[PDB]
RNA sequence: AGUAUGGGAGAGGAUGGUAGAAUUCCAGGUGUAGCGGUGAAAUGCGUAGAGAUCUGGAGGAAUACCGAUGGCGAAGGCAGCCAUCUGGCCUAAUACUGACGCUGAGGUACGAAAGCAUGGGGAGCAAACAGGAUUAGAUACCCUGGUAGUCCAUGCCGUAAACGAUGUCUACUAGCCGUUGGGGCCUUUGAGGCUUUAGUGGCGCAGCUAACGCGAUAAGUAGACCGCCUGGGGAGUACGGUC
């Protein structure tokens, strides 16, 4: 599980201003890190459906934020997906 | 509360060794839950008997 | 790291070894890392019900702060040592250092 | 563990032990162990008991 | 032949019968009697009167071994527990302590089905 | 509508250990004619020694008391204790983004019990079946036994009176009495009293309803989107198709 230090580094790296925590870039970065971390957990416990629901909710939230950012500003969307290595 | 307070724990045990209900003792729900946890830990540690 | 509290019941015939086993465990904790916040020897106690046809035991309480590997080694040592007949390990958040009841 | 003192009679011992067992309520568990009760029936009975308890509390309040 | 002063009585009282067993401590049997052994065949085995009759026979049989004070344990929800424990005092023993030792599972095995009588 | 930082409650989920009670069986002492079962009996067990009582051993399954009109979960569901991995919820104040929302045809995921496939395990219970009763007959209810199954691992099946017989989201509309998890205030020394919030219950005004009844957890007053109904049988049936 990610801790406060890792989350702080992610926020510092993707912040668009000072004390910025609500930006779509920051939110998508945090969601991506959390999903990538939980992949290892779901490798071992194949039958944790109750936690897999929360994972699916994270995926859906990330997709919605990406769609909103693409609708608003295309260049920022391209830069963010390039930085995080997302295929789309 | 914790399992090492055996003198306190005996105050909520009948002669048979069973836990006394909150409706009889006059306890808060959370305090009762902590009491039950501590008593079950004490029985395992053999500080107080299971039955009789 | 995480704080653990361990309680051990020792066979009274092997009570002459309790000092040795306890310093061995504490040392291993030290070269691992560790911070022994508390060690209490409750002493000789009657069991409420006999265990394995034993009626008296030596009660030892330890408070440690360790990692997962050190915890696994401690658990396996407790499992394999024949003198230790029962042990309880509880995770707690906060270091406990004050003298507790039963230390009399 | 009804331990008699120096000079109670047998009948007094019997009645005091009967009162102790009535307080203990072992016979209720022994009767319950005679046959298997299904979870549906158990939940129904406990719901009825709760309803009766709440009805009794209001009556005792008034 | 053997002489012992302190003994234990066991009253196994079911809904179909009652067995009164007299032993010494450490559980070595000395004398016993049941309602079936005094006639009382069939359903009459469960009456309190039969329990009293069996208890009297058992106490008199144990008097030969020569017990004067005994400890009584009653197990089972039988209708003859009270008569069985009373008859011993009439016989003449001293009941030091009498208790209940009925077993209760801590949610163990599954009991049989309910009778649709 | 969402994000970061402090705190809190919980049978929420997955994995692995471990404890006590009880049932069955086995071995051994004490001991001797019954035990068991029913409305009453009988089948059955026992003098190559039961049942009862005491000691030791093996194995499987479930977690008394606490326990609650309690709690958690989208639903199905989840109860001994401990460790590891992990989801959601409640609560305070600032800070941040700036409509990023609601619903949802097709689709997809989960989904009690019974059932199926491969390999294990098997204490108790127990469809099928065997015997004893009852009865005009008993195919059943009652009794004595008892195999699948109930348990574990890996998959399938996709159905229940899967029910609050009440789709999801939002706002507004008298009061009174309880209970669970938090916040605030007041006494005044520690136990109480007022509020506010998110759940969970009992009455009840207006309003609604064929009536029963519902009534801030609406079946009231309104808005958005979806699913479904059109007399009873034939019939959730045939044909075709998909799995």
UniProtKB/Swiss-Prot annotation, chain A:
One of its GO terms (molecular function) is rRNA binding. This is Small ribosomal subunit protein uS15. InterPro entries: Ribosomal_uS15 (IPR000589), Ribosomal_uS15_bac-type (IPR005290), uS15_NS1_RNA-bd_sf (IPR009068). The keyword Ribonucleoprotein applies. It comes from Acinetobacter baumannii (strain AB0057). HAMAP family: Ribosomal_uS15_B (MF_01343_B). PANTHER family: RIBOSOMAL PROTEIN S15, BACTERIAL AND ORGANELLAR, SMALL RIBOSOMAL SUBUNIT PROTEIN US15M. Part of the 30S ribosomal subunit. Forms a bridge to the 50S subunit in the 70S ribosome, contacting the 23S rRNA. Keywords: Ribonucleoprotein, Ribosomal protein, RNA-binding, rRNA-binding. One of the primary rRNA binding proteins, it binds directly to 16S rRNA where it helps nucleate assembly of the platform of the 30S subunit by binding and bridging several RNA helices of the 16S rRNA. Forms an intersubunit bridge (bridge B4) with the 23S rRNA of the 50S subunit in the ribosome. Disulfide bonds: none annotated. GO terms for biological process: translation. GO terms for cellular component: cytosolic small ribosomal subunit.
Swiss-Prot record, chain C:
This is Small ribosomal subunit protein bS6. GO terms for molecular function: small ribosomal subunit rRNA binding; structural constituent of ribosome. Coiled coil: none annotated. GO terms for cellular component: cytosolic small ribosomal subunit. Disulfide bonds: none annotated. Belongs to the bacterial ribosomal protein bS6 family. One of its GO terms (biological process) is translation. The chain holds residues 1 to 104 of 127 of the full protein. The lineage of its organism: Bacteria, Pseudomonadati, Pseudomonadota, Gammaproteobacteria, Moraxellales. Keywords: Ribonucleoprotein, Ribosomal protein, RNA-binding, rRNA-binding. Binds together with bS18 to 16S ribosomal RNA. The gene is rpsF. Transmembrane segments: none annotated.
């Amino acid at each position: 599980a990610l801790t406060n230090a890792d989350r702080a580094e992610i926020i510092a790296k993707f912040a668009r201003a000072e004390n910025d925590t609500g930006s779509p870039e920051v939110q998508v970065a945090l969601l991506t890190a959390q999903i990538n971390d939980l992949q290892g957990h779901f490798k071992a416990h194949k039958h944790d459906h109750h936690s897999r629901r929360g994972l699916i909710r994270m995926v859906n939230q990330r997709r919605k934020l990406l769609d909103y950012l693409n609708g608003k500003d295309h260049e920022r969307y391209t830069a963010l997906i390039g930085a995080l290595g997302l295929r789309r | 509360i914790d399992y090492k307070d055996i003198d306190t724990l005996k105050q909520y045990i009948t002669e048979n060794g069973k836990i006394v209900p909150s409706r009889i003792t006059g306890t808060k729900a959370r305090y009762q839950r902590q009491l039950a946890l501590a008593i079950k830990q004490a029985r395992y540690l053999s500080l107080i008997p299971y039955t009789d | 790291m995480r704080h653990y509290e361990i309680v051990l019941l020792v066979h009274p015939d092997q009570s002459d070894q309790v000092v040795g086993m306890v310093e061995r465990y504490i040392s291993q904790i030290k070269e691992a890392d560790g911070q022994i916040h508390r060690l209490e020897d409750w002493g000789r106690r009657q069991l409420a019900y006999p265990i394995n046809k034993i009626h008296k035991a030596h009660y030892i309480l330890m408070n440690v702060e360790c990692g997962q590997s050190t915890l696994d080694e401690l658990e396996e040592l407790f499992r394999y040592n024949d003198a230790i007949i029962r042990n309880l390990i509880i995770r707690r958040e906060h270091a406990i250092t004050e003298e507790s009841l039963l230390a009399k | 563990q009804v331990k008699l003192k120096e000079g109670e009679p047998v009948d007094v011992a019997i009645r005091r032990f009967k009162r102790s067992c009535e307080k203990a309520g072992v016979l209720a568990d022994v009767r319950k162990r005679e046959f298997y009760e299904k979870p549906t029936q158990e939940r129904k009975r406990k719901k009825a008991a709760a309803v009766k308890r709440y009805q009794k509390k209001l009556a005792r309040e008034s | 032949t053997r002489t012992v002063s302190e003994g234990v009585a066991h009253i196994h009282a079911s809904f179909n019968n009652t067995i009164v067993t007299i032993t010494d401590r450490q559980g070595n049997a000395l004398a016993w009697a049941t309602s079936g052994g005094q006639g009382f065949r069939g359903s009459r085995k469960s009456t309190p009167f039969a329990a009293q009759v069996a208890a009297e026979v058992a106490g008199k049989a144990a008097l030969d071994y020569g017990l004067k004070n005994l400890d009584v344990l009653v197990k089972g929800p039988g209708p003859g527990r009270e008569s069985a424990v009373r008859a011993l005092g009439a016989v003449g023993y001293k009941i030091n302590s009498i208790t209940d030792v009925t077993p209760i599972p801590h949610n163990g095995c599954r009991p049989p089905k309910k009778r649709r009588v």
